[PDB]
Design a protein around this ligand. Structure first.
Ligand SMILES: [Zn+2]
Ligand SMILES: [Zn+2]
Length: 413
């Protein structure tokens, strides 16, 4: 007998004999898990690590939420699936268009591929803007798919999500968006789906609310992972093959006085090339956000026609805190990004700095806590832990977070 598989974006996924789950712990710098385990708070993960496979993996650059979640969902980098940031910029018109509609996704998800092959598939997200992207191609007319967010759980319908009111079903209220509870709801839904829906493939993805606010080992960070471990214990006990990974890590990005350490790339370009001659794009969030949540460690810039790219790149690279400056072609090759959705140049900042646009009009500091963020090479390293024995599993840099489902189904097969 030949083995059964589903081929997605040029990769062969064996059919899972038991449920295959990947958990994306948004912003889970490996240190978070080490600290919580050391504090005695994660007995399930501690045992799972001892008996299974423990690795570090590499995220996609930019180490942001959307590109990495869609990489995990498709098993491919953004050069394939097209989601390389939260929005794209069109030099003509000067328009910034949001990249939340599934129409922007250019490759099928593993979820759709398994669904079309007759599998039962579940996808649960914390925030809703990722739900439609991750659910692209799923259908809800055969009782074989469920896709909803914690955020909009009370709005789920049979026809569009595979479930009527996931909040009522789970018996928990819709959580506050800016809370740990938004992610707890995902874990709880995942457990109930594993028990009652019995998916062949399931993805659970959280938000990095806690991780932006709290460093590894502090009480509020530890409590989040203590909470997660309870659900991990239950998922594991139910017999599923599980990969625990992250979309990206998290690092402090503040000066000694606790204020954000920012390089204002638009200001610099306005001086060298002329005001607004170039356009700096910050992929981390939506462009209308102006409250410190727009500060990440990766940026791209669209330059005026004719200007010396090579010279501008050297001027930027010379600045202490700007670690990497690459042209479109090199950046897309190295970071596996689509040329048509990236600027003329790509910038990556140092470990404890972020990239901003301008000081004129400025980006206001909202929350009190010292800035923590991601986007750079220094948040590329993430945990990759499997609750099965897998001696052949690679390690970073060869192992990618978007190998999660490949190895989850392999473990399950
Ligand atoms: Zn994230
Ligand atoms: Zn974040």
């Amino acid at each position: 007998m030949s083995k059964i598989s589903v081929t997605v974006n040029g990769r062969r996924y064996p059919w899972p004999r038991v449920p295959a789950i990947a958990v994306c712990l948004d912003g889970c710098e490996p240190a978070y898990l080490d600290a919580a385990i050391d504090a005695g708070l994660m007995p399930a993960l501690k045992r799972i690590k001892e008996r299974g496979a423990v690795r570090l993996a590499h995220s996609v650059i930019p180490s942001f939420t959307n590109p990495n979640n869609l990489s995990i969902a498709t098993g491919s980098p953004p050069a394939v699936h097209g989601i390389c940031g939260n929005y794209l910029y069109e030099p003509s018109t000067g328009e910034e268009v949001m990249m939340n509609d599934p129409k922007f996704l250019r490759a099928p998800t593993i979820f759709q591929a398994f669904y079309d092959a007759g599998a039962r598939v579940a996808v649960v997200t914390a925030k809703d803007k990722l739900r439609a992207l991750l659910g692209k191609g799923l259908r809800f007319d055969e009782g074989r798919a469920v896709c909803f967010s914690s955020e909009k759980s009370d709005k789920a319908t049979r026809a569009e999500h595979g479930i009527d009111n996931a909040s009522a079903w789970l018996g928990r209220p819709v959580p506050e968006v800016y809370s740990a509870a938004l992610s707890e709801f995902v874990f709880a839904a995942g457990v109930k789906l594993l028990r009652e829906f019995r998916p062949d493939i399931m993805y659970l993805t959280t938000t990095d609310y806690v991780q932006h606010k709290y460093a590894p080992g502090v009480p509020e960070a530890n409590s989040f992972y203590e909470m997660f471990d309870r659900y991990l214990a239950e998922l594991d006990g139910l017999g599923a093959a599980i990969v625990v990974t992250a979309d990206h890590g998290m690092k402090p990005k503040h000066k000694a006085d606790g204020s954000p350490d920012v390089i204002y790339v638009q200001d610099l370009l306005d001086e060298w090339l002329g005001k607004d001659a170039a356009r700096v794009i910050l992929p981390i969030t939506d462009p209308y956000v102006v409250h410190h949540g727009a500060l990440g460690s990766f940026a791209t810039a669209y330059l005026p026609d004719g200007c010396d790219r090579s010279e501008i790149m050297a001027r930027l690279k010379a600045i202490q805190g700007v670690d990497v400056v690459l042209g479109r072609e090199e950046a897309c090759r190295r970071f596996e990004l689509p040329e048509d959705r990236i600027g003329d140049i790509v910038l990556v900042s140092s470990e404890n700095k972020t990239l901003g646009t301008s000081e004129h009009r400025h980006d206001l500091a909202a929350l009190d806590e010292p800035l923590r963020s991601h986007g750079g090479l220094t948040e590329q390293e993430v945990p990759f832990i499997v609750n099965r024995v897998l001696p052949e599993l690679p390690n970073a840099p060869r192992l990618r977070n978007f190998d999660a489902f490949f190895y989850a189904v392999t473990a399950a097969a």
